[PDB]
Design a protein around this ligand. Sequence first.
Ligand code: NA
Lengths: 91, 91
Amino acid sequence: STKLEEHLEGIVNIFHQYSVRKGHFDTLSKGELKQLLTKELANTIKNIKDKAVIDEIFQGLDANQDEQVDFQEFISLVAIALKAAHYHTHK
Amino acid sequence: STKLEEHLEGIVNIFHQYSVRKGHFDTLSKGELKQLLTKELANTIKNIKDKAVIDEIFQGLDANQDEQVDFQEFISLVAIALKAAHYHTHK
Ligand code: NA
């Protein structure tokens, strides 16, 4: 299995831990996507120069805390953050 | 960093190992993208039972091989492949 694959695995795993710990097997509520992100991308978030971006995401995650979401949704939000940070993941 | 953030970074790196080879430096042509996937998702791919999920994506990429896509495009294409392989990323 490839280098790229292994990291993808890593992220699936973490995502998967959250969903299971909070109820469902491969979806996780919005509410607890907000805590995921804020804990796990915290470095990255700090790095974002335009906070209006996560403010949104979040002012959106809070807005409907119970809707389950799947990894694809997850990863997508992870990436949007990622862009806003200019792909700096670092304290 | 964070396990997650460490994985993100590793991924961005792979992407840049690619992006950096031709043309513009933080993007690539879809033709290149198709090459990225063939090599770096190879088994996730050989692990997707519906052989049309990729096929179609690959068609899309051939049909406009010159068009430039960034990390976001990449990643969200990845997300699709992962989902189609129910997250099997080993041979
Ligand atoms: Na390039």
